[PDB]
C-alpha cells in the first residue's frame, strides 16, 4: 500500500479546469481509495501512478531469497512421519468415501462437499506418495 | 481337404495323413499336429490304425510315458513310418534333456545314461559334446549346477509415468 501524490493549485480547481490533463488512457485503471477521497484525494492533490522498474538481474537476486537448495530438492521426508500422514489421510478419505456414498445414494433416490474434499485428499495422497517414491528411487541410483 | 465332394474317397489317404502326423511329432510341431487332428474326422482317429498310431504316440509322449513311446516303435502300421520314428527318437531325447534342464538338480552319469537313453557307454559323452550344459564331469557331473538388486531405474520410469498421466491436461 504505497501511493504518490502532487498538489493541485488552488486557482486551477476553482477555474473549473481539471487538475490534470487527460491525453491518453494510461494513468487511469487505478481505483482511488475511500480513505484518500474522504481526506480529499482530488480536492487538494492527485494520485500519480506508481510503476516499478524491475531488472532481470535484480529479479534473480530477489529469487535467491527463498530459492530452494538442491539438498532440499533431493531430500526425503521422514519415513515414520510419511506413514503416519498416509494413514491419517487414508482414514479421512475413508470417512469422506462413506459420506460421498450416502450423498450419491440420497441424491439419486430423491432425483458437492464430499466429492470435492475426497478429490483434494486423493490429490494430496497421490502427489506426496509419488514424490517420495521417486525421490527414493533417485537416491538409490545416484548415491551408488 | 479341398475338393471332398467332387473327388471320390482315396483309400490310399489315411496312411499318408498319419505319416504327416508322425512327421509333425518328429519335428516337434505339436500345435500343427493338433490342428491336423482337428481337421481330420473324429471317427477315424479311433476307427483307423494309420491315424491312430501317431495319435497314440503323441498321447504317450504328452502323458510322459517315454518308456511306452519307445516300446511303441514296433507297431508300425506300414513301413512308410520309418526314419520318422528315428527323428522322433532324437526329439524324445531332446525333450528328456529339457526335463533334466528345468529339473533334476545335481544328476549323475549312470542314472543319466539309464534315463536319457544314450548310445554305447563309450559314446556316453554324446549330448555333453553337443548340448553340453557346461556339464563339468566332476565324476558326478554336478549338473553343472545349471538353473536382490532394486530396479530403481525401471521403478522411477513407472513413477514418472504416473506423474505424467496425473499432470497432463486431458
Sign, Cα dihedral of B135, B137, B138, B142: positive
Contact between B62 and B31 under an 8 Å Cβ cutoff? The reply is: no
Contact between B133 and B165 under an 8 Å Cβ cutoff? The reply is: no
Residue A95 grid coordinates:
470417512
B 137-166 → A contacts, CB under 8 A: 150, 152-153, 155-156, 159-160, 162-163, 166
Residue B120 grid coordinates:
554305447
**Non-local CB neighbours of B69 within 8 Å, separated by 6+ positions:** B57, B60, B61, B92
How far apart CA B54 and CA A22 sit, in angstroms, is: 106
List the Cα angle A22/A25/A31 in 5-degree steps: 90
Sign, Cα dihedral of A19, A22, A27, A29: positive
**Non-local CB neighbours of B135 within 8 Å, separated by 6+ positions:** B128, B141, B142, B143, B144
Q: What's the resolution in A? A: 3.1
Contact between A141 and A126 under an 8 Å Cβ cutoff? The reply is: no
How far apart CA B88 and CA B27 sit, in angstroms, is: 7
How far apart CA B137 and CA B141 sit, in angstroms, is: 4
Contact between B75 and B53 under an 8 Å Cβ cutoff? The reply is: yes
The DSSP output letter for A26 is B
List the Cα angle B131/B137/B143 in 5-degree steps: 65
User: Greatest CA span in chain A, whole angstroms?
Assistant: 83
How far out from the chain centre does Cα A42 lie? 33
How far apart CA B99 and CA B130 sit, in angstroms, is: 17
How far apart CA B88 and CA B76 sit, in angstroms, is: 13
Angular region, B145: left φ>0, alpha ψ -120 to 50, beta rest: left
How far apart CA A78 and CA A20 sit, in angstroms, is: 62
The DSSP output letter for A27 is T
| C-beta atoms of A133 and B163 within 8 A | no
Considering only the beta carbons, identify the residue of A126, A127, A140 that sits closest to B152.
A140
For cell 490533463, name the residue. A21
Q: A-B interface: how many C-beta pairs under 8 angstroms?
A: 25
Q: Which residues of B touch A140 (CB under 8 A)?
A: 150, 152
Please tell me the total number of residues recorded for chain B in this structure.
170
Sign, Cα dihedral of B133, B134, B139, B143: negative
Amino acid at each position: 500500500v504505497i501511493d504518490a501524490f502532487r498538489l493541485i493549485n488552488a486557482n486551477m480547481m476553482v477555474l473549473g479546469h481539471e487538475p490534470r490533463q487527460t491525453t491518453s488512457n494510461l494513468g487511469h485503471l487505478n481505483k482511488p481509495s475511500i480513505q484518500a477521497l474522504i481526506h480529499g484525494l482530488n480536492r487538494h492533490y492527485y494520485s500519480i501512478t506508481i510503476n516499478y522498474r524491475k531488472n532481470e538481474l535484480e529479479q534473480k537476486m530477489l529469487l535467491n531469497l527463498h530459492k530452494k537448495s538442491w539438498m532440499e530438492g533431493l531430500t526425503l521426508q521422514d519415513y515414520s512421519e510419511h506413514c503416519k500422514h498416509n494413514e491419517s489421510v487414508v482414514k479421512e478419505m475413508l470417512e469422506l468415501a462413506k459420506n460421498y456414498n450416502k450423498a450419491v445414494e440420497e441424491e439419486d433416490k430423491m432425483t458437492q462437499d464430499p466429492k470435492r474434499h475426497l478429490e483434494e485428499h486423493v490429490d494430496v495422497l497421490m502427489t506426496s506418495n509419488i514424490v517420495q517414491c521417486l525421490a527414493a528411487m533417485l537416491d538409490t541410483v545416484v548415491f551408488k | 481337404f479341398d475338393y471332398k465332394e467332387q473327388l471320390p474317397e482315396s483309400a490310399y489317404m489315411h496312411q499318408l495323413l498319419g505319416l504327416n502326423l508322425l512327421f509333425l511329432l518328429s519335428q516337434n510341431r505339436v500345435a500343427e499336429f493338433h490342428t491336423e487332428l482337428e481337421r481330420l474326422p473324429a471317427k477315424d482317429i479311433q476307427t483307423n490304425v494309420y491315424i491312430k498310431h501317431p495319435v497314440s504316440l503323441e498321447q504317450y509322449l504328452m502323458e510322459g510315458s517315454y518308456n511306452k513311446v519307445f516300446l511303441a516303435k514296433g507297431n508300425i502300421p506300414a513301413e512308410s513310418y520309418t526314419f520318422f520314428i528315428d527323428i522322433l527318437l532324437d526329439t524324445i531325447r531332446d525333450e528328456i534333456a529339457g526335463c533334466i534342464e528345468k529339473a533334476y538338480e545335481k544328476i549323475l552319469f549312470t542314472e543319466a545314461t539309464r534315463i536319457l537313453f544314450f548310445n554305447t557307454p563309450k559314446k556316453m559323452t554324446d549330448y555333453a559334446k553337443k548340448r553340453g550344459w557346461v556339464l563339468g564331469p566332476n565324476n558326478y557331473y554336478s549338473f553343472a549346477s545349471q538353473q536382490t538388486t532394486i530396479p530403481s531405474t525401471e521403478l522411477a520410469k513407472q513413477v514418472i509415468e504416473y506423474a505424467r498421466q496425473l499432470e497432463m491436461i486431458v
